[PDB]
């Protein structure tokens, strides 16, 4: 069941984002984020279930005074929305003086992020678990590469992200899910394909040239997007296929997650 921590050993450094959530320090030394809420019983149990190498670790609940707290593992590098954006084609611009070898990720390191948020979405989808909500603002980077599935429903920061209709990620969504709320483990697997896509551009927001409203009769309509500057064709193939209009003609997340490690194993050593 779910394990318990004494707030004693809770030492809170400051804010990292907003519900509000804070870095500190846990005893029994070690660095976590300690989520703090103004439902969290069924979070917990949910969170303590869901035990994968690419779901942020959970360690445990504070229920002695207020507010209740969610104690997580540390992500250094943040968000993968934000991580693309600082190392993307403009990150010697955006680098600080001390930034380690600034520049763009590389074909490999792309393959490898994509690869690790798949692994994470297959452990899910093995579960009959949908996320509703995958992009990679939803998902955190720690040090090494090590990619991670995060929340599962965001920052505030990101509320641009979100159409009120109840905030929907309409530019992650495929059409039946726009139209009738209908969440699967084929919306998510359309979610993936958009997630590829926000990978290849360095972060880009899908259908950034449209309003909320044009983006949704983009996406009803069946207008695809772009292939990226960055994006290989082969790459571009798999997020066809996670973007067939057809839930059920959809690719399985095993197989993009098996083509994708294909992929990047083909491209390790060069
Ligand atoms: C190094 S920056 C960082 S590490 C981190 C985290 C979470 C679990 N482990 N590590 C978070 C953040 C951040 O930028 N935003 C925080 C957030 C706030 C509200 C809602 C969703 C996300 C979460
Ligand atoms: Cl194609």
Not at 104 to 129: C, D, E, I, K
Not at 182 to 198: A, C, I, M, P, R
Request: with cysteine; proline share 4%; charged share 20%.
């Amino acid at each position: 069941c779910v394990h318990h921590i004494k707030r004693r050993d809770i030492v809170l450094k400051w804010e990292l984002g907003e519900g509000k959530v804070f870095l500190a320090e846990c005893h029994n030394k070690m660095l976590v984020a300690v989520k703090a809420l103004k439902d969290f019983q069924r979070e917990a149990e949910l969170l303590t279930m869901l035990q994968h190498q690419h779901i942020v670790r959970f360690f445990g609940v504070c229920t002695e005074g207020r507010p209740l707290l969610m104690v997580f593992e540390y992500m250094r590098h943040g968000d993968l929305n934000r991580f693309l954006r600082s190392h993307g084609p403009d990150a010697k611009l955006l680098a600080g003086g001390e930034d380690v070898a600034p520049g763009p990720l590389g074909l490999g390191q792309l393959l490898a992020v994509a690869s690790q948020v798949a692994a994470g979405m297959v452990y899910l989808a093995g579960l009959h678990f949908v996320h509703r909500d995958l992009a990679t603002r939803n998902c955190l980077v720690g040090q090494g590469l090590v990619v991670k599935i995060g929340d599962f429903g965001s920052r505030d920061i990101y509320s641009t992200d979100y159409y009120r209709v109840t905030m929907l990620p309409i530019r992650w969504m495929p059409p039946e899910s726009i139209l009738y709320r209908k969440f699967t483990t084929e919306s998510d697997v359309w979610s993936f394909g958009v997630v590829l896509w926000e990978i290849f551009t360095y972060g880009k927001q899908p259908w950034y040239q449209l309003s909320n409203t044009e983006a949704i009769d983009c996406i009803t309509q069946g207008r695809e997007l772009e292939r990226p500057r960055a994006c290989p064709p082969e790459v571009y193939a798999i997020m066809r296929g996670c973007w067939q209009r057809e839930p059920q003609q959809r690719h399985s997340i095993k197989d993009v997650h098996a083509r994708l490690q294909a992929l990047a194993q083909a491209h390790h050593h060069h």
